Design an enzyme around this catalytic site. Structure first.
Site, PDB file in Angstrom:
ATOM      1  N   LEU A 185     -80.444  35.695  35.892  1.00 52.85           N
ATOM      2  CA  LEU A 185     -81.123  35.745  34.948  1.00 52.85           C
ATOM      3  C   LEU A 185     -81.234  35.055  34.171  1.00 52.85           C
ATOM      4  O   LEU A 185     -82.185  34.545  32.662  1.00 52.85           O
ATOM      5  CB  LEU A 185     -82.351  36.492  34.481  1.00 52.85           C
ATOM      6  CG  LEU A 185     -82.558  37.701  33.600  1.00 52.85           C
ATOM      7  CD1 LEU A 185     -83.113  38.245  33.304  1.00 52.85           C
ATOM      8  CD2 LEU A 185     -81.101  39.145  34.243  1.00 52.85           C
ATOM      9  N   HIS A 186     -79.619  35.408  33.410  1.00 52.21           N
ATOM     10  CA  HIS A 186     -79.074  34.686  31.878  1.00 52.21           C
ATOM     11  C   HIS A 186     -78.983  32.890  32.133  1.00 52.21           C
ATOM     12  O   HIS A 186     -79.650  32.534  33.759  1.00 52.21           O
ATOM     13  CB  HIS A 186     -78.012  35.121  31.866  1.00 52.21           C
ATOM     14  CG  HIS A 186     -78.048  34.378  30.307  1.00 52.21           C
ATOM     15  ND1 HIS A 186     -76.271  35.028  29.614  1.00 52.21           N
ATOM     16  CD2 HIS A 186     -78.817  34.053  29.208  1.00 52.21           C
ATOM     17  CE1 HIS A 186     -76.342  34.886  28.665  1.00 52.21           C
ATOM     18  NE2 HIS A 186     -77.692  33.838  28.127  1.00 52.21           N
TER      19      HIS A 186
END
Length: 94
Positions: free
Chosen positions: A28-29
Site C-alpha cells: 500500500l506504500h
RNA sequence: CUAAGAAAUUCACGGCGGGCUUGAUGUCCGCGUCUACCUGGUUCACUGCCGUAUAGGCAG
C-alpha cells in the site's frame, strides 16, 4: 532509528491470517512508483519450517526517514492519544 | 501338540418341429413454503518481462 514499537499478542478482528499475511507487507506504500520517499526496510526474523508454514507474525524493521519526513500528510495518524508511551526499548547490540 | 495326522471324480454327447392374446373405459377437487447470512481459508498453467548449473535494467 531506535523508535520501534511492538504490540503484544492481541487478536485483531480486521486482519484474517489466511492468504494475505505474507503478501501485503509494503504494497500500500508508493514504493513501486517512487515519486516521493524511497526508504523502506523488509525483514523476516521467523524461520520455522515444521509443517506447511514459514512465518506468521509481524516484525519488519523499516527506515528512519519514512516515519518522520514522509508523514507530513495524514496517512498513519489518528491513533495519537490512545495510550501513554512507556519505558523505551533499546537497539540490540548482538 | 488343534474330531490331530492322509487323499486325482473322469471320459463322450444335435433339444426340436409349430403357433392370432383379444375387445371396452371420465382420475378429480382444494391449497401461503417461510425467515437470516463476508467464500477477507490454500476454488486448471489466456498470443509482446536477453540462457537447468545456484549468475544478470520488474513508473504490473
Amino acid at each position: 532509528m531506535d523508535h520501534y514499537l511492538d504490540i503484544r499478542l492481541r487478536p485483531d478482528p480486521e486482519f484474517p491470517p489466511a492468504q494475505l499475511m505474507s503478501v501485503l507487507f509494503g504494497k500500500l506504500h508508493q514504493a513501486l512508483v517512487a515519486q516521493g520517499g524511497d526508504r523502506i526496510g523488509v525483514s523476516f526474523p521467523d524461520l520455522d519450517e515444521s509443517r506447511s508454514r514459514l512465518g506468521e507474525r509481524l516484525r519488519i524493521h523499516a527506515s528512519a526517514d519514512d516515519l518522520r519526513a514522509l508523514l507530513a500528510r495524514p496517512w498513519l495518524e489518528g491513533l495519537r492519544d490512545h495510550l501513554q508511551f512507556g519505558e523505551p526499548a533499546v537497539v540490540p547490540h548482538p
